[PDB]
Design a binder for this molecule. Structure first.
Ligand code: NA
Ligand code: NA
Length: 158
């Protein structure tokens, strides 16, 4: 009744390749809040700003016991470079096959260039300690976004 999105059950057991060489799964994050932010491409201005914004707010997320995951379809090596360059203290998911993206339905289509063009739409989600998607932001505007996500988390966690 509180879920704004229903994920296929298998989503929670998908092995998610992380920056740094390990994997996680959504089920492995049971027991705490999880912020999942999707962005199209490593190292672009918008995505760097978004990542730096979350990073700067990390202690506030820590206060709530929450964890952050950034997600794009870039490689682990790209993610490692991006993370090292920017100093991110949270992991990035290398969703190269877009399995996680599809589960969250963030692969959106646009009729452009006389074609049907599919791409990651910047989107963010809040997953409860019990794995429910309780809030979604789509077609995300970077400015003020991380602040808004934090506020929403604090409202939901209470
Ligand atoms: Na993978
Ligand atoms: Na969770």
């Amino acid at each position: 009744t509180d879920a704004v999105l229903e994920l296929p059950a298998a989503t929670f057991d998908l092995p998610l390749s992380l920056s740094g060489g390990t994997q996680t799964t959504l089920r492995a994050h049971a027991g705490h809040w999880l912020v999942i932010y999707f962005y199209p491409k490593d190292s672009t201005p918008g995505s760097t700003t978004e990542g730096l914004d979350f990073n700067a707010l990390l202690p506030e997320f820590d206060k709530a016991g929450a964890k952050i995951l950034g997600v794009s379809r870039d490689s682990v090596k790209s993610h490692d470079n991006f993370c090292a360059k920017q100093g991110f203290a949270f992991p990035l998911v290398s969703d190269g096959d877009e399995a996680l993206c599809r589960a969250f339905d963030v692969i959106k289509e646009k009729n452009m260039y006389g074609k049907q063009v599919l791409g990651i739409e910047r989107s963010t989600f809040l997953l409860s300690p019990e794995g429910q998607v309780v809030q979604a932001w789509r077609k995300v505007k970077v400015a003020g976004h991380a602040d808004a996500v934090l506020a929403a988390l604090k409202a939901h966690a209470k």
